[PDB]
Amino acid sequence: SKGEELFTGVVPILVELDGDVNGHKFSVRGEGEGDATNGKLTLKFICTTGKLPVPWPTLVTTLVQCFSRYPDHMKRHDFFKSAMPEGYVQERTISFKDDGTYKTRAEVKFEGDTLVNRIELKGIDFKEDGNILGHKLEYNFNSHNVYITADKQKNGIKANFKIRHNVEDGSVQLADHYQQNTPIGDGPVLLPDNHYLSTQSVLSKDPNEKRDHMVLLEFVTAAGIT
Amino acid sequence: QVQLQESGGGSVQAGGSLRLSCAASGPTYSSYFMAWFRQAPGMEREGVAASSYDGSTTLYADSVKGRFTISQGNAKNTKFLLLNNLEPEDTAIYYCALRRRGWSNTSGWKQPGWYDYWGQGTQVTV
């Protein structure tokens, strides 16, 4: 609630991911801006190692919930800003239905004026011509609701939600998300009553960009209380 | 959880130079703001030099007078502190400190409570 003040106005973002899926190494670097007042994120991510061995949509969730818009009557339920600048750790298992599993570990914290997300991603059990490794996913991302609950004993929060990726053949590839977040610092944080975040994203491409990349526009709002 | 290799102390005559090392082994997604403090015999820990994770900000205390330089290491969270033009007043044990918590500014860098993980130090004698 004191860290709320760091997200007035527009904040530069740096994202950095080191990944390994079924042995294929790759790095992603992203940069952009976030405006929590309007719950709006604009970012451009670039695969620095070459061609991205997975579809870009499967990395959206891994690639900064502190930029969500919490209505005034919900401010005391915003865990993510309360942890700043000191930051938080974010851990996920992402289980793709009848395909592999991603495991991710990340620090989200300020480094000066910039909010940084450093991620380590680990992927196993992907069938070499599934929807993921066989690049069979549409270049888009559907709207979702992320349900948050408190994790009082780790002084953090948890979330469970389902991501529905559109497959180029009309079917839908689903990805179960299990997530927990813990303060990095010792200072106090807001622990919340169960709410959800409602998200909407637009994916696009930079025509002047030759590297494999993703431009992303996100709008996130908190809801579900009183 | 996170561990601290520190190396490269020793002894010199007035004017000489030594290079301290420090590396942080831990989760490879973690970044640390890294510093060296030094403690004289019965005096307190004071700040010497400090540098952000990316080498983008580098800070020195008044006792340094542009004689000491931090340089970024080969690897992720590893750095060297080069001590030039050493004088007997610089004799002390030199502790590597790491800050994992995020930060908005570096005004606090000279306080030991700004950090999170400390070394055992190394001796530096002239």
Q: Is the Cβ–Cβ distance between A43 and A215 less than 8 Å?
A: yes
Residue closest to B107 by CA, chosen among A112, A178, A48: A112
- Partner-chain contact B102 A18, CB within 8 Å: no
Give the torsion sign (CA, A79, A81, A87, A88): positive
Cα distance between residue B80 and residue B49, in whole Å: 11
Token pair, residue A137, equals 């996913």
Identify the CATH number of the domain in which residue A121 sits.
2.40.155.10
Token pair, residue A61, equals 């969730």
Across B76-113, b (16+ Cβ under 10 Å) vs e yields bbebbbebeebeeebbbbbbbbbbbbbbbeeeebbeee
* DSSP H or E stretch at residue A175: strand A172-183
Query: Nearest CB to B102: which of A86, A119, A120?
Result: A86
- Partner-chain contact A87 B27, CB within 8 Å: no
User: 3-state DSSP call for residue A77?
Assistant: helix
Q: To the nearest whole angstrom, how far is the Cα of B78 from the nearest Cα of chain A?
A: 17
Query: Nearest CB to A105: which of B29, B54, B102?
Result: B29
Taking CB atoms and an 8 Å cutoff, what residues of chain A touch B102?
84-87, 109-111, 116, 184
Cα distance between residue A155 and residue A221, in whole Å: 23
Token pair, residue A144, equals 């979702």
> What residues does B70 pair with on adjacent strands?
B81
- Minimal-distance CA residue of chain A relative to B30: A107
- Partner-chain contact B52 A111, CB within 8 Å: yes
Domain that holds residue A116: 3-223
Identity of the amino acid at B86: L
- Partner-chain contact B104 A113, CB within 8 Å: yes
Query: Nearest CB to B30: which of A107, A110, A112?
Result: A107
Q: Is A31 on the interface with B (CB under 8 A)?
A: no
Could you tell me the domains of chain B?
A: 3-124 (2.60.40.10)
Q: To 10 degrees, the CA torsion angle through B13, B120, B70, B68?
A: -30
**Which positions ≥6 away from B36 have C-beta within 8 Å?**
B20, B22, B47, B48, B49, B50, B81, B94, B95, B96, B97
Q: What's the N-to-C CA distance of chain A in angstroms?
A: 19
**How many domains, in total, are found in chain A?**
1
Query: Quick one: resolution in A?
Result: 2.2
Q: Is the Cβ–Cβ distance between A70 and A80 less than 8 Å?
A: no
Tell me, rounded to whole angstroms, the distance of Cα A123 from its chain centroid: 16
